[PDB]
Amino acid sequence: NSINDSKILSLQNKKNALVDTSGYNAEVRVGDNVQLNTIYTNDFKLSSSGDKIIVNLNNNYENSSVSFWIKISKDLTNSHNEYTIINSIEQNSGWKLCIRNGNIEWILQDVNRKYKSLIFDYSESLSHTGYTNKWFFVTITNNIMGYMKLYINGELKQSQKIEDLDEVKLDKTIVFGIDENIDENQMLWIRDFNIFSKELSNEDINIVYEGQILRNVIKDYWGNPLKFDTEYYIINDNYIDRYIAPESNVLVLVQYPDRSKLYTGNPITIKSVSDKNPYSRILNGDNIILHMLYNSRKYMIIRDTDTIYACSQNCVYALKLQSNLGNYGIGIFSIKNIVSKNKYCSQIFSSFRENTMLLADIYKPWRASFKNAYTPVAVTNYETKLLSTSSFWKFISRDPGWVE
Incomplete structure (x- = not known):
């Protein structure tokens, strides 16, 4: 004005x-x-x-x-x-x-x-x-x-x-x-x-x-506009020196073999569902897909159809890789910047069979063992954890500004 x-x-x-x-x-x-x-x-x-x-x-x-x-x-x-x-x-x-x-x-x-x-x-x-x-x-x-x-x-x-x-x-x-x-x-x-x-x-x-x-x-991460087809190392705000790795058919956040760096882990490229220009801008409320590069092949990150426990009331699903690419709803997410005057990060959401949100914490992603792990999961009643940092995700891209 x-x-x-x-x-x-x-x-x-x-x-x-x-x-x-x-x-x-x-x-x-x-x-x-x-x-x-x-x-x-x-x-x-x-x-x-x-x-x-x-x-x-x-x-x-x-x-x-x-x-x-x-x-x-x-x-x-x-x-x-x-x-x-x-x-x-x-x-x-x-x-x-x-x-x-x-x-x-x-x-x-x-x-x-x-x-x-x-x-x-x-x-x-x-x-x-x-x-x-x-x-x-x-x-x-x-x-x-x-x-x-x-x-x-x-x-x-x-x-x-x-x-x-x-x-x-x-x-x-x-x-x-x-x-x-x-x-x-x-x-x-x-x-x-x-x-x-x-x-x-x-x-x-x-x-x-x-x-x-x-x-x-x-x-x-740098405040630059996020782009499709671009490789990014995804990190959860609570565990800045951990990276997303498949493990045993279940994604988990692994300890960085050397903190002094930043570009570590399995690079994740973001794809467009409504398919548009290659490296164009990803906007608020846009349907995306997540391809991970692990073992000489790309994988589609998806929501585990079975909760982390043996549900439609407060359930926690794990995250798996899916060999078959393609537009599969089970793999459709959304990302919305978080309003933060100090850090650039977003919240990822999924609305497949129910409305989940991604956050990271300690769980037992396996039914086989009493095995503990810091893993990324999708909740169903995120109204509560909508302000927890365990839900903030940062996207580190190789940036000309930060060389190592």
Whole structure:
């Protein structure tokens, strides 16, 4: 509403050139070697050295803010060096965003090279519980009272008044890129860069966050849109260092022979029931099928027709592989992102003979023995466990951002 009314710059991909649609006609020159629109429509990649995008605006303590998504690759966020990725200081005054040792910080320097800044530790020390190589929304607001805030995914992460600091004068130009000499491994993505001529409020910022994330598109581990025909290592949120493996005619979550990694286990490709374009986006409420690659052949993951016990009232079925591919209802699932400002994961559902949900825990998936196992199962009355993390599933895809 009155949010879009204040956009003075808005980098979006139209034909096949990144341009300004704010309506203020800013000059946007993109380096021929820059990959635009590969993950999300209005994203671009800061890859090679001296690879940049130049923005020349038009003439036009104050009210205004900036937003944009950013995704930094493990190696680049691993480095010790400070990388000024977004520069807007022509002489010695202005603003510029930069990243240095797993942190992202917003700097504001006056005409006498003095500054002020808000910083954020997007990497919980590279903990799988952090944002390394994961799309996270940023937002910087500045108002007249001198207060300037830094929000992440719509949450205030830092307040601060522009105190000890002389005069600052913005610059008609803005440069994206890492002029320093980098390597492949060192890469980051940015999408939906926007600038408002007004201090956005917490309540406004979340709205922008809610329409840019794309609720109906299922996301993979990195926050990228999930895709059909793409290989993914599926992990349940409670057992991050376990993988889905067949075992004895019954899928179970097995201990990772080496945690230090991430890409371990039996890769699972997702197929479309209503069959459509090969690597197209998987949407909320879409019928899918799950093929697993194990023993030089593909298998269709299905719901065990017999409960885990010797039913139509609170039953737990195991998961089996099915030699015969094809559109078999018993193998039809659904995935719906979970609303979580901190992690990208989904809930899988099945409605074959009854409405089941997938979650993982300790069971005795076998009738033969008193054998224990951490296995994935389908319940029938998930109204209860609809909020348990044992129902959250993450999809790890080989990502250029995370190399090992």
